[PDB]
Amino acid sequence: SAIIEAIEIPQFIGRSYLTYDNPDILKRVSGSRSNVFMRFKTTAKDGLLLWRGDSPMRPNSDFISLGLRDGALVFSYNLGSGVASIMVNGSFNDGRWHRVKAVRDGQSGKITVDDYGARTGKSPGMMRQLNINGALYVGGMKEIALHTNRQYMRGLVGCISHFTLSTDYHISLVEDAVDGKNINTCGAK
Numbered sequence: 048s049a050i051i052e053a054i055e056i057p058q059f060i061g062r063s064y065l066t067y068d069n070p071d072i073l074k075r076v077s078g079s080r081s082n083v084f085m086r087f088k089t090t091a092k093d094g095l096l097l098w099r100g101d102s103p104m105r106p107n108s109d110f111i112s113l114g115l116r117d118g119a120l121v122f123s124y125n126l127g128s129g130v131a132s133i134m135v136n137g138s139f140n141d142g143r144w145h146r147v148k149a150v151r152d153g154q155s156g157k158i159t160v161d162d163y164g165a166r167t168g169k170s171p172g173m174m175r176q177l178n179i180n181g182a183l184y185v186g187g188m189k190e191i192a193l194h195t196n197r198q199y200m201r202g203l204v205g206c207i208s209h210f211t212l213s214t215d216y217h218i219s220l221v222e223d224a225v226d227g228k229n230i231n232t233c234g235a236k
């Protein structure tokens with residue numbers, strides 16, 4: 048027989064998310080340095096890919112975020128003195144896989160999608176450190192509008208195949224999550 052075995056790729060339907068509270072994971076979403084890699088695909092123009100902020104979310108709370116806006120990828124973060132928002136202008140909601148690398152050291156941030164030209168930006172003020180107490184969310188989150196200060200209204204509609212932090216620290220999306228909502232295999236349903 049031709050039965051294949053493989054590692055599940057999670058699918059998100061807008062009200063879906065995976066949550067991580069593993070200290071070994073959260074410790075890499077904190078401090079002055081951040082390195083996020085993701086491979087994803089979607090047909091929806093908007094959607095949250097990654098988020099970690101404060102709970103309860105306050106107006107000037109720290110956060111780091113990755114998401115889609117009208118097909119464009121937006122890397123955003125607040126370190127305590129203002130938000131950086133760095134966009135790679137594209138139409139990545141074409142239902143094909145795209146890889147995004149988002150890198151930050153202190154205030155300075157950089158995001159590269161596929162082989163398109165990288166875009167850079169900088170958080171204002173003097174704050175250089177991510178000081179966040181919430182769990183790490185992928186593909187969406189519970190009460191997304193409240194917890195992101197209305198920066199995102201829906202989670203991802205699509206799939207996420209790869210998620211790496213610190214260039215080298217692979218996250219097993221399904222197995223490493225402490226919880227999930229409305230998650231199924233990519234392509235099923």
Ligand SMILES: *[C@@H]1O[C@H](CO)[C@@H](O)[C@H](O)[C@H]1NC(C)=O
Binds near residue numbers: 136137
């Ligand atoms: C992004 O691309 C669109 C084309 O779809 C263009 O109209 C728009 O001006 C671009 N944005 C920037 C900031 O160049």
